Design a binder for this molecule. Structure first.
Ligand SMILES: Cc1cc2nc3c(=O)[nH]c(=O)nc-3n(C[C@H](O)[C@H](O)[C@H](O)COP(=O)(O)OP(=O)(O)OC[C@H]3O[C@@H](n4cnc5c(N)ncnc54)[C@H](O)[C@@H]3O)c2cc1C
Ligand SMILES: Cc1cc2nc3c(=O)[nH]c(=O)nc-3n(C[C@H](O)[C@H](O)[C@H](O)COP(=O)(O)OP(=O)(O)OC[C@H]3O[C@@H](n4cnc5c(N)ncnc54)[C@H](O)[C@@H]3O)c2cc1C
Lengths: 584, 572
């Protein structure tokens, strides 16, 4: 299989990417089953959920449980239905239609249940999973505290073995715990003797466990969110999850999964925003025509759709990498779960990119969706108004986008140290080719060219910054974020290029016109951003004559014949408005 | 008086711009008075206003009225206090601290009262203004309908002079009418015989007038917003405002005022977002230190502050232009109102620039303020959470930002036809030399790009919306850059370089980023307009206009932030 982060340094091929065109009939059916559940059962109640009628959430969760939608990532031997990772991504994508209920569901099947799936011992799995898989029990994940959010290992909740040695005694408060109103089981992190950061399976019914009132939130109002209060909470010794003092291993692994899952979710929402905006544009008339006839409206729709194509392509690529790493695993390995966790941890970089890129694309799409609706976009009666409010938290969830950006360059450098990525050996090849100094004829020739040059620019800039600050590069946050933004744009560009290239080779040029258009337009603009990020970093890192050298090298890497995107965006929009949905 | 739009073609000097450093003691004292009222009287009740306790709104408005805060733009002759335009802008800036109540107050003093102030006859003014000016009566403005928002002249409300010829009979619905729960007077637009678009003074008690229940809104929840329902509404003939079929004159003139006033409001809000974000950054610790010590946090604050400086500078520049034309008028001209409307209409371009640029700067500041707060930014018990939701509608008010951008280039053309308008290594050492250079080249780039576009499309340029917006965006950035440059240049000439280090830093960082956007907008426009070798030549000319030695903005943003975090507020 393909190594994590290798896209930056190797010429990835259409055969090495998974795309939505690779979905089986099984994937498509599960997607339709979920969609029908959400549309037929959930949406008619959504307005009561937003009013915190949590009895309805619980009932709906258990109905979802009966359809196998809560147990897709749980193995059959523990009472799950054991679907592949593509299937459970598609389930999350379709759940996004239900606003904050997608958060409820995601916290149950993801951060809440997966710590037991991946790190539970045999006894813990046979006990908890059969019930979690059907929704008979519901789960929540309790890491954050008032004093510890981004710095999640700064938790102040303590755990101390009682005189009898039979139970841990937990004290503290966990903040903003999704599902708290109705969760039966909480994965709680606490420091044993105030020293050793550890995870615990904590039942709601254990002595000393309670919750605060609901938070008043901007959006995702139908998701339950409370503080978990632990006042000599009594947790059986055997409910320790993983090893004493190694709670960070669970938290870090769970985070990766949360990241890409949120990516998939934001992609579902961005598609829905495109759809309702396109339908609105066709019906709303001003100046005696559908506002759909206005180029500025068409332009907003095309930007929204092209970003969504790039997000959808890069997210399912990551899901595909996870699945092909999973392919290697025997049934004993999958059952244990340690190998499943490592199969995704391999792609921690791609997960963080998806999370930041997906949440920002959704941020842009709901914002233009509101603008397309005008004053109706500001009215609670309209679906886009709720989406606008729900979206804002995604840039904060699962690691703020700042933290997610800051960790990307260091992850690359750590992989270069451990010998997983030939970064030094590849950085020195480029130093020569630069002192050595057209495009091609195939469809996508120009975009393939920009993708290749983007890789070189990222490497050049990252190499130069590391050689300049050394081990103290960690303090230069503005630079780190430029590099992270370069890598993120590069990953989305390549994902879009390769997916379109694969489609062409699969179904022809004529049928893949919309993909080609999204690709040309997105690549041009994303490459423009890459160039600006590189310039800012070069200027911060060098000066005088040496800086003019580097800037000419960048100009050489960046020179091409720009496209006229204005008619292309009108062409993209025509098809979106024709289908009244995001289309590919 | 400097002509409207002349900033694009002429070299404006520090003497031809008004800045906050030009505020008089009276200006400052009116600002302080308003702020004391907001902080001491309004904010302790704001949570209840958000729950639609309008009884409190009404009482607070009448209390503002007793301090003269509702009659600043009303002549002394009609029972107001008759202050200058700078004073009334400052009142608006300070009202922004109270969220949706600034929209309540604004709708009363602005779109609600000004149509009578500006276009009322003597009898209309003498009857309505004394009561509006003190808040004994409250006003609202009703133009929008379900079928007509941006296309406001598409109103379907009809007016029919009754058989007796004493009353117009009005039928229709007006949508999203601010202050509806408690307004005594509504300025209503309707088409006489379904043809002649006209304005009317409509009292709440007139037969056939009612309102819907309150809208459920994303933000500014404490602002009342209902449908005005006219079912054979009986309006006296003498309540026709202006002339039959000439309602557009009123609506266009009122829009100009609404635009710059919202610009002013959004500047007050952006300053507040900077302040609360800097205070939060200093108090919140993660990884054993205040998040203020993290460069990424510093960079956010510094971007928020520099944008706010450019917005504050360009908005008060426009207010000064208005004030300068007002300076000329006799007491009698001011009284008749038409010349006051004319004095702002002249600067229609600058008003639209301010409205779009201010609303987008605030959109950025509240979004980064929420990000600085993390999860707390998404919780209703934090002020930034409410600001983030309040802000979203500003990009839609007073002309959507799309419409405000679309009318800019065509307005430059109309001012032209009407006769109101027609090397980087040399730059130097003097403060701001590069930034002055960039402002000048930005003007050239704007003119070059618009000129080439008009040549290609001619009169059919109005269909090329994407290119028109590119031009508008170049013009907006230019007006903001030049305003920040002249304000800073003015300050250096007045009080010295050392005392104005913060202003220099704002102008340097803002100008580099804004100029980079201008280049990108110019490039997109040239690529859409030419092709082949003529394109290569134009792109090569643009290269010449954009060439310069760029600054390292990263250390400068750290310096900006250090001063913001020390003062815990936006400072200049
Ligand atoms: C509605 C909601 C539901 C939630 N549900 C759960 C849940 O079920 N389970 C759970 O465990 N958690 C949950 N959380 C917690 C959540 O994911 C945190 O909000 C988040 O992890 C960030 O923490 P913070 O809000 O304290 O922000 P902070 O960590 O205080 O960050 C504030 C700002 O400083 C920046 N910053 C922090 N560190 C650095 C640095 N070193 N360098 C540069 N900038 C930095 C951040 O990016 C941010 O912009 C929930 C939160 C919310 C809002
Ligand atoms: C909370 C609230 C309070 C309000 N209070 C008042 C009030 O007191 N008095 C009053 O008169 N009005 C009031 N309004 C009306 C408000 O200002 C309108 O929403 C605004 O003027 C736009 O109209 P619309 O919402 O119907 O959007 P639309 O006109 O339908 O616009 C929809 C979209 O199409 C775009 N568009 C429209 N035409 C074109 C075109 N020619 N080219 C390109 N794009 C175009 C717009 O930019 C927007 O993106 C209020 C509105 C709200 C939301």
């Amino acid at each position: 299989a393909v190594k994590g982060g290798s896209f930056l340094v190797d010429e990835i091929t259409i055969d090495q990417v998974f795309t939505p065109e690779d979905f089986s009939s099984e994937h498509k059916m599960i997607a339709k089953t979920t969609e029908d559940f959400i549309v037929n059962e959930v949406l008619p109640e959504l307005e009561y959920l937003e009013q915190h009628e949590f009895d309805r959430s619980v009932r709906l969760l258990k109905e979802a449980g009966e359809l196998g939608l809560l147990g897709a990532d749980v193995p059959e031997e523990y009472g799950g239905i054991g679907l592949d990772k593509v299937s459970s991504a598609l389930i999350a994508e379709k759940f996004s239609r239900a606003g904050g209920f997608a958060i409820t569901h995601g916290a149950h099947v993801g951060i809440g249940s997966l710590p037991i799936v991946l790190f539970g011992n045999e006894e813990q799995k046979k006990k908890y999973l059969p019930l979690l898989a059907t929704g008979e029990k519901l789960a929540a994940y309790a890491l954050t505290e008032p004093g510890s959010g981004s710095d999640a290992l700064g938790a102040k909740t303590t755990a101390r073995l009682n005189a009898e040695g039979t139970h841990y005694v937990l004290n503290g408060e966990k903040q903003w715990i999704t599902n708290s109103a109705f969760a039966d089981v909480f994965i709680v992190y606490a420091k044993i003797d105030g020293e050793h950061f550890s995870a615990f399976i904590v039942e709601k019914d254990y002595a000393g466990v309670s919750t605060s009132p609901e938070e008043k939130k901007m959006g995702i109002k139908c998701s339950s969110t409370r503080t978990l209060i632990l006042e000599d909470a009594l947790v059986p010794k055997e409910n320790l999850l993983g090893e004493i003092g190694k709670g960070h291993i669970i938290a870090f692994n769970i985070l990766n999964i949360g990241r890409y899952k949120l990516g998939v979710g934001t992609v579902g929402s961005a598609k829905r925003a495109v759809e309702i905006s396109a339908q609105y544009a066709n019906q709303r008339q001003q100046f005696k025509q559908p506002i759909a006839r206005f180029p500025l409206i068409q332009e907003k729709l095309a930007n929204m759709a092209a970003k969504t194509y790039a997000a959808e392509s890069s997210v399912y690529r990551t899901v595909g990498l996870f699945e092909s790493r999973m392919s290697t695993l025997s049934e004993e390995e999958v059952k244990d779960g340690k190998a499943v966790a490592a199969s995704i941890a391999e792609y921690a970089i791609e997960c963080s990119l998806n999370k930041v890129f997906g949440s920002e694309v959704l941020d842009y799409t709901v914002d233009e969706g509101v603008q397309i609706h005008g004053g109706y976009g500001f009215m609670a009666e309209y679906e886009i108004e709720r989406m606008y409010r729900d979206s804002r938290i995604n840039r904060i969830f699962e690691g703020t986008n700042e933290i997610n950006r800051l960790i990307v360059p260091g992850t690359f450098l750590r992989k270069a140290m451990k010998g997983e990525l030939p970064l030094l050996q590849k950085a020195q090849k480029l130093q020569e080719e630069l002192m050595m100094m057209e495009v091609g004829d195939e469809p996508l020739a120009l975009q393939k060219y920009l993708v290749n040059n983007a890789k070189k620019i990222g490497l050049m800039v990252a190499g130069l910054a590391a050689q300049k600050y050394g081990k103290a590069l960690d303090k230069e946050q503005e630079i780190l974020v430029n590099i992270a933004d370069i890598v993120s744009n590069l990953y989305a560009m390549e994902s879009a290029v390769l997916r379109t290239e694969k489609a062409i080779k699969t179904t022809g040029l004529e049928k893949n016109k919309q993909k080609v258009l999204y690709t040309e337009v997105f690549c041009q603009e994303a490459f423009n951003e890459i160039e600006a990020h590189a310039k800012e970093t070069l200027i911060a890192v060098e000066n005088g004559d040496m800086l003019r050298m580097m800037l000419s090298s960048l100009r050489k890497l960046t020179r091409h014949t720009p496209l006229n995107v204005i008619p292309k965006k009108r062409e993209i929009a025509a098809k979106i408005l024709e289908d009244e949905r995001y289309t590919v």
